[PDB]
Amino acid sequence: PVTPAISGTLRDHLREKGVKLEAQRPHGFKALDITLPMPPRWTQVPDPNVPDAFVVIADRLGNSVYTSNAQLVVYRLIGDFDPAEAITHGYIDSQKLLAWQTTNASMANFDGFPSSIIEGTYRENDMTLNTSRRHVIATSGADKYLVSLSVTTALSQAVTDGPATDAIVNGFQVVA
């Protein structure tokens, strides 16, 4: 019902619209109340090495050479733009990943805001990962934020870590 764009990742489209992205950090952050469930045995990863990270959680005791994790990134957006238009670029950063294949995609609104979610598999370091990637363009009062959540697992763990990744993906919530 909502048609996706093909040219330009969400970030590049906002750049080209003249918007500035300012990475937020959780301590002190009030504009939004974000729930990111933390499943049993997962913990916050101090010192993640995800640029612009707002919070990174992970299951450090997993099997797999790949540690299952969720990454949340929150940008305050400076400049005017139409969010519903920007959001139609929401799949493109995932669809550029090596060997991307899609399992689920939706551009339905999420908690009342324009949003995209795409889920699927891709290759990285000789390993197949399963991932779920949501962008939310949220409004708090007079500001706009891009909230982005990735939840990734090795494809070999996608069923074993299913209850964790599910509680994260489906418990996720963004409130102004």
Binding site for Cl ion (CB under 5 A): 29-31
CB-nearer residue toward Cl ion: 24 or 153: 24
- Are 5 and 88 in contact by the 8 Å Cβ rule? The answer is yes
- Are 35 and 55 in contact by the 8 Å Cβ rule? The answer is no
For the CB of residue 145, give the shortest distance to Cl ion in the complex, in Å. Answer: 9
DSSP one-letter code for 25: -
For the CB of residue 32, give the shortest distance to Cl ion in the complex, in Å. Answer: 8
- Are 155 and 121 in contact by the 8 Å Cβ rule? The answer is yes
Q: Give strand pairing partners of 70.
A: 57, 151
CB-nearer residue toward Cl ion: 73 or 169: 73
CB-nearer residue toward Cl ion: 27 or 80: 27
For the CB of residue 159, give the shortest distance to Cl ion in the complex, in Å. Answer: 38
What six digits make up the tokens of 116? Answer: 């995209």
